[PDB]
């Protein structure tokens, strides 16, 4: 995946936008742009609106100005994105026709959605057992374990949807950059994986603080709190609210506290193993390739649709992989998640990736592991023998907030 | 402000008010604010605020609440950065501790009146019978942001009835590399798009 990031940063055409005018700059020192068009696409949350191509005639170290036509200006809700591609129409000795050599993206206009959703014809019903809070609406059932405090299972008809409960996750299968030169024999305490392991991040057990059900006029409200401890020290606290409304939508609100003096965690999100194994993964966000907070400049905001196999990156030493960032919608089988999040999705658990030394020893697990993070630590890589993740990409904030909506389709 | 949603619910141990406003100007929606007020058996009001800011409007000066209190107390007591005025890009000299000052010292008499007297990184603020807890920046004065904005000299300011309280989840840097061009650096601009902050309002 890193190659695209190299391609994007090393590109020979740099862009600036002012109003509807694009300043293209040439960083070539000897040749004109004698084999280059600029293609441009304007899109509203992935749906294309306007297109077009304009010839490029930039002297070496020169500038060309390009005025766009009066773009489409819809009242419909969403963010408008401009994307430009530089395309070589002709083959070279090193490339074939239609090769893309450079690109750049901008947000244009956003119109926030102000409409209230239409009132539902139905109210979701709460069923209280000693062991469970269960919620029914139509063909759909939700079950919350009152001993654990997690969503244990969801139903569409007789069909169960989960193999593992939906739980918080503050750890990732360590990257080569998290490990450095640390070895089982000779530990390096300065490596991120060792700081994490020493602090109990990987061995932290969840302790239920609160687990409460309430009925509202139009919804059921499940409210929970867990503390993750290691040998007496409280590392993380997660407070959630699950709000299931008449439309079959489950709004999850997460509010996490991280102890100031524990090593900054690798991620703040949820994960679960779903029962479904679908062939395609469709998301609105940065893509199409794998991208991380400190490696997402080559990625672009659009609708992407790839096979599940392409959402796993076969690094020979298995680690956390296949994350996409800045995602507003994710689709997998009947499931849809909405919000503002990072995700990865594969047949391989963070547990299996962490414990397996070679990609050829991995086995597909029963279902599909889904990690949804509100926040993810940078990957670093200025070197691979000392901590390389810059301060801006470490999760030091202390308090974190993220919101998901889980619904069916 | 245009009211979108205003609902009440009764829970086992508390009452929950949920609201949603849109701030508009000539057809353009600039901000949306979704809140939950949760008043529980202990007389404590827990307010959750979730704001959207349009990506193409200028990054706003602050994101918080404000009210005029009836109370005028003689002292202000807070746990956070102080004792002096401090802003996000000017708080290195400030130190985290419990600060107790006269309300006079919570206002900075700049000759040209502006926003002033903010303290940042505060977990607890105490004024008269009121306590607010959370993670916020505040200023507290007898002078509304409106009076300060409309007044050109400090000697023409008049104490209004009661006490104006600004509690911000987030507050833009003050800049100052020069004062004839924008000088607040990107990291101190409110460009995130979605913001969240949480207060609890208390009696003592
Ligand atoms: Na491994």
Range of the domain at A65: 11-116
What lies within 8 Å, CB to CB, of A188 at 6+ separation is: A180, A181, A182, A194
Is there a single domain that holds both residue A108 and residue A200? no
Q: Which residues pair with A241 in a beta bridge?
A: A223, A253
Q: Quote the minimal CA–CA distance from B150 to chain A in Å.
A: 31
Q: Do B7 and A79 touch (CB under 8 A)?
A: no
When computed from its CA atoms, the radius of gyration of chain A, rounded to whole angstroms, is 24
Tell me the C-alpha distance between A72 and A20, whole Å.
12
Question: Using CA atoms in the order A171, A172, A178, A183, what is the torsion angle rounded to 10 degrees?
Answer: 90
What lies within 8 Å, CB to CB, of B42 at 6+ separation is: none
Q: Does A128 touch chain B (CB under 8 A)?
A: no
Q: Quote the minimal CA–CA distance from B57 to chain A in Å.
A: 9
* Closest residue in chain A to residue B28, using alpha carbons only: A111
> Is the preceding omega at residue A297 within 30 degrees of 0, hence cis?
no
User: Which structure tokens are listed for A42?
Assistant: 């304007």
Tell me how many domains chain B contains: 1
Please give the helix or strand (H or E) that residue A213 lies within, else none: strand A205-215
Is there a single domain that holds both residue A173 and residue A86? no
Is there a single domain that holds both residue A88 and residue A132? no
Tell me the C-alpha distance between A62 and A26, whole Å.
5
Please give the helix or strand (H or E) that residue A225 lies within, else none: strand A219-230
Residue A223 buriedness (CB in 10 A; 0-12 / 13-18 / 19+): middle
Q: Does A216 touch chain B (CB under 8 A)?
A: yes
Of the candidates B96, B77, B71, the one whose C-alpha atom is nearest the C-alpha of residue B86 is B96
Q: How was this structure determined?
A: X-ray
Is there a single domain that holds both residue A111 and residue A126? no
Is there a single domain that holds both residue A294 and residue A247? yes
> Which resolution in angstroms does this entry have?
2.8
Helices first, then strands: H and E counts in chain A = 4, 25
Q: Quote the minimal CA–CA distance from B17 to chain A in Å.
A: 11
Is there a single domain that holds both residue A89 and residue A129? no
Q: Do A114 and B55 touch (CB under 8 A)?
A: no
**3 state SS of A359:** helix
> Is the preceding omega at residue B83 within 30 degrees of 0, hence cis?
yes
Contact (Cβ atoms closer than 8 angstroms) between residue A143 and residue A154: yes
Is there a single domain that holds both residue A110 and residue A126? no
Q: Give the sign of the dihedral formed by CA B109, CA B115, CA B121, CA B127.
A: positive
* Closest residue in chain A to residue B135, using alpha carbons only: A399
Contact (Cβ atoms closer than 8 angstroms) between residue A320 and residue A175: yes
Is there a single domain that holds both residue A360 and residue A291? yes
B23 marked among binding-site residues = no
Of the candidates B204, B201, B202, the one whose C-alpha atom is nearest the C-alpha of residue B47 is B201
Q: How far is the CA of A315 from the centre of ligand 1 (A)?
A: 10
Cβ pairs A/B, distance under 8 A: 41
Is there a single domain that holds both residue A133 and residue A195? yes
**Chain B hits for A293, Cβ within 8 Å:** none
Q: Does B93 touch chain A (CB under 8 A)?
A: no
* Closest residue in chain A to residue B23, using alpha carbons only: A114
Q: Could you give the C-alpha distances from B96 to A403, B85, B124, in angstroms and in order?
A: 31, 13, 12
Residue A166 buriedness (CB in 10 A; 0-12 / 13-18 / 19+): buried
What lies within 8 Å, CB to CB, of A93 at 6+ separation is: none
**3 state SS of A170:** coil
Is there a single domain that holds both residue A127 and residue A204? yes
Beta pairing class for A78-88 and A37-44: antiparallel
Is there a single domain that holds both residue A154 and residue A283? yes
Of the candidates B46, B48, B43, B41, the one whose C-alpha atom is nearest the C-alpha of residue B12 is B41
Is there a single domain that holds both residue A109 and residue A130? no
**Chain B hits for A340, Cβ within 8 Å:** 194
């Amino acid at each position: 995946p890193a190659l695209t990031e190299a391609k994007h940063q090393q590109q020979f055409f740099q862009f600036r936008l002012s109003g509807q005018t694009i300043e293209v700059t040439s960083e070539y020192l000897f040749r004109h742009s004698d084999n280059e068009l600029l293609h441009w696409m304007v899109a509203l949350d992935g749906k294309p609106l306007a297109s077009g191509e304009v010839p490029l005639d930039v002297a070496p170290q020169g500038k060309q100005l390009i005025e766009l036509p009066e773009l489409p200006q819809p009242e419909s809700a969403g963010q408008l994105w401009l994307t430009v591609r530089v395309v070589q129409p002709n083959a070279t000795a090193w490339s074939e026709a239609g090769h893309i050599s450079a690109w750049q993206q901008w947000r244009l206009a956003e119109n926030l959605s102000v409409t209230l959703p239409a009132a539902s014809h139905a109210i979701p019903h709460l069923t209280t057992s000693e062991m469970d809070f269960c919620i029914e609406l139509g063909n759909k059932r939700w079950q919350f374990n009152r001993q654990s405090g997690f969503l244990s299972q969801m139903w569409i008809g007789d069909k169960k949807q989960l193999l593992t409960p939906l739980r918080d996750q503050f750890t990732r299968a360590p990257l080569d950059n998290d490990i450095g030169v640390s070895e089982a024999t000779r530990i390096d305490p300065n490596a991120w994986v060792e700081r994490w392991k020493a602090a109990g991040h990987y061995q932290a057990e969840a302790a239920l603080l609160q687990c409460t059900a309430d009925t509202l006029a139009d919804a059921v409200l499940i409210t929970t709190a867990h503390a993750w401890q290691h040998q007496g020290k409280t590392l993380f606290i997660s407070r959630k609210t699950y709000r299931i409304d008449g439309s079959g939508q489950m709004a999850i609100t997460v509010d996490v506290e991280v102890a100031s003096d524990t090593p900054h965690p690798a991620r703040i999100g949820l994960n679960c193993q779903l029962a479904q194994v679908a062939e395609r993964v469709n998301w609105l966000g940065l893509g199409p390739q794998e991208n991380y907070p400190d490696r997402l400049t080559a990625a672009c905001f659009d609708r992407w649709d790839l096979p599940l196999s392409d959402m796993y990156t076969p690094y020979v030493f298995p680690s956390e992989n296949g994350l996409r960032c800045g995602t507003r919608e994710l689709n997998y089988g009947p499931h849809q998640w909405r919000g503002d999040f990072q995700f990865n999705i594969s047949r391989y658990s963070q547990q299996q990736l962490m414990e397996t030394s070679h990609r050829h020893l991995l086995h597909a697990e029963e279902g599909t592991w889904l990690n949804i993070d509100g926040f993810h630590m940078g990957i670093g890589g200025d070197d691979s023998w000392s901590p390389s993740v810059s301060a801006e990409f470490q999760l030091s904030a202390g308090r974190y907030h993220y919101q998901l909506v889980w619904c069916q389709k």
